[PDB]
Symmetry: C2
Subunit: 396 residues, 2 copies
């Protein structure tokens, strides 16, 4: 059977990454991944995670499944992180959380659940995007539609264009919003803007869906969820797909969460069961190590605090790197005003390199940036920052 099978590789994941590993070159730099690096170039394990794994190691007695909502405070702490401690949603027991596969695993659960149990017809996605989000809603059989989310001349959000595009979004549709750090501009809506949105949302009858993979990498933990909370304040229903693989550096452990918010206690429990069993329909049982590390760190006041600090540490090094990046480019002789990189959010920078300019960095300088022009500012160090800009100022 296996004889006439065709090969496969091309995928710019293992691709523009193992290709880097097999680039037999001197000072080659890797700005094309989505990991946090410290100043020496390594990718540490959070010490708050290391300590948490220690507690598991000599307190575990069984290694059995307790269900998808069976890990103690995973669900409870997840909601506290999203909606705020003391949030009316959590008092009125209006949310419910399930563990899912890493990152995309959550968004796939939501889609599969949305299809099996609601007459939802269309899902509105942001454009430009990175196409990833589009295929998932299709493979469950929901049509996807684009809305305009991009920047103006002044490197600001074209917020009018956002609304206009979303005009045709019918009620009983689903709209996807990135909670924070919006690949591909790094530009997130002002607080005033989120409320204008949420008000339009509740008015025109959308079912909002939030992705949340980089919580804490914009301004802070509680501040990045300002948008989401603005929605929850006057919404009856919404779905939220979160992910701990970035903010916990449990990269490989694939720890994701789907969170269902319905009108009242009963309505959500009834629905959550369909979701719960929509997961049993699929990818079998979920990984339990990652969910436990998270739960342990979040449910105890002391570890939670160390981890809070470690995260901030990461953010601040990145915010610092953005500065050094802009400055170096200026003094290495770029003409263009790159003062906008500073106002960008999260791990990435978008100077808008052409798809050629990007390839000429790889091929001619060994600087690896994603095909689009996304550069991982978190992989920049004071050591490699300098030839980095040279390569980039030479490409123009």
């Amino acid at each position: 059977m296996f004889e006439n099978i065709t090969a496969a590789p091309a995928d710019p994941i293992y691709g523009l990454a193992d290709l880097f590993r097999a680039d037999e070159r001197p000072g080659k730099i890797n700005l094309g991944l989505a990991l946090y690096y410290d100043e020496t170039g390594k990718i540490p394990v959070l010490t708050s995670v290391k300590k948490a794994e220690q507690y598991l190691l000599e307190n575990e007695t069984t290694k059995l499944y307790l269900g998808i909502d069976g890990i103690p405070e995973f669900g409870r702490c997840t909601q506290e992180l999203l909606f705020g401690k003391g949030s009316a949603l959590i008092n009125d027991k209006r949310a419910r959380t399930a563990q899912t596969p890493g990152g995309h695993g959550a968004l796939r659960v939501a889609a599969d659940f949305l299809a099996k149990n609601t007459s939802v017809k269309r899902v509105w996605v942001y454009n430009p995007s990175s196409n990833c989000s589009k295929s998932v809603f299709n493979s469950a059989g929901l049509e996807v539609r684009e809305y305009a989310y991009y920047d103006a001349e002044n490197h600001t959000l074209d917020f009018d264009a956002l609304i206009n595009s979303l005009n045709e979004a019918q009620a009983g549709d689903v709209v996807l919003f990135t909670g924070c750090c919006h690949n591909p501009t790094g530009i997130d809506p002002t607080l005033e803007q989120w409320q204008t949105l949420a008000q339009l949302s509740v008015e025109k009858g959308w079912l909002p869906l939030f992705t949340f993979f980089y919580q804490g990498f914009a301004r802070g933990l509680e501040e990045d969820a300002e948008g989401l909370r603005a929605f929850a304040a006057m919404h009856k229903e919404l779905i939220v797909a979160s992910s701990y693989s970035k903010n916990f550096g449990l990269y490989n452990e694939s720890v994701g969460a789907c969170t269902l918010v319905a009108a009242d206690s009963e309505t959500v429990d009834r629905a959550f069961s369909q979701m719960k069993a929509a997961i049993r329909d699929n990818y079998s049982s979920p990984p339990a190590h990652g969910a436990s590390v998270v739960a342990t760190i979040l449910s105890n006041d002391a570890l939670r605090a160390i981890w809070e600090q470690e995260l901030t540490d990461m953010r601040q090094r990145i915010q610092r790197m953005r500065q050094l990046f802009v400055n170096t480019l200026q003094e290495k002789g770029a003409n263009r005003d790159f003062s906008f990189i500073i106002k960008q959010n999260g791990m990435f920078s978008f100077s808008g390199l052409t798809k050629e300019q990007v390839l000429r960095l790889r091929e001619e300088f060994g600087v690896y940036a994603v095909a689009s022009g996304r550069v991982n500012v978190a992989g920049m160090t004071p050591d490699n920052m300098a030839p980095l800009c040279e390569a980039i100022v030479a490409v123009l």
Copy 2:
């Protein structure tokens, strides 16, 4: 949207399990699950696992994904366990192993891969079964067919009936075989019989597919794979879906494997890539904790040996329990000769309780067995063995 959503529960998994937990009764017994219990009624973690987790705890530095074949010796050790060390398959680099979700995750990969890349039309399943296997091959769009695998008057395999049923199995079809401990009779093919099968297989042109979730729970590690190895000895291709969640007691950690065996080095690598990317097509990245614990235990000669012992320990307690079970029933006044339970394989026993007799045990005695009549002999202890049989001799 969520208002007119219907409830869901019924599933005899969380069902006849949490229903046990909420049975407010005295000496209630739970023979309806698939876990190993020690003599005090608890479900330990393998000490060989505990030591392995320690090694990971202070030797890990990154927590990144290395790919589906990225964990060092996971794949290499998996094949050694299946085909034997020094096996011609492993020298000729003819196999390739990928990590998958727990248990069913492997079998779903194989199906999805089989569909996307081969003109395979039918999958032959054993009947009677527990229906689980059937839905999987469907949801990838392969038609499934039944073959006869059951017992005679004398509690032996009706091996002729097996063959006869498999007569119409066309070439370029896939036949599924349970490697060992065959739910639902506990009767596995004699070595002589496996070869007769394998010979028929190579003759009539089937693509064999082996499931292997209980390796080591029959007679021993190397012996349970006699059947599989007999096939491999003269086969050109086959797929094997293994699972570590039982023999490692990594119940929650969901550690599964799919193994692709092709004609030669090149053919397999080309094909394995389609499989590899058929996994990226879906359930996202796989859990890495469980694969690492296994890899650690298997790749080092010392831990491997402790774990070898722990497994045997489980088997022997179970084989011992079978005895006590038969004897007690005899002296508690059953008339029927239950001497056949002794020759049964794995964790389960099949006295063939009626679907009423099973329910009357739950409702009238608090003895929880699966709706079919499968009893988990591994959940029997010298303490609960006695009222257990009373309940069963009273119902029978």
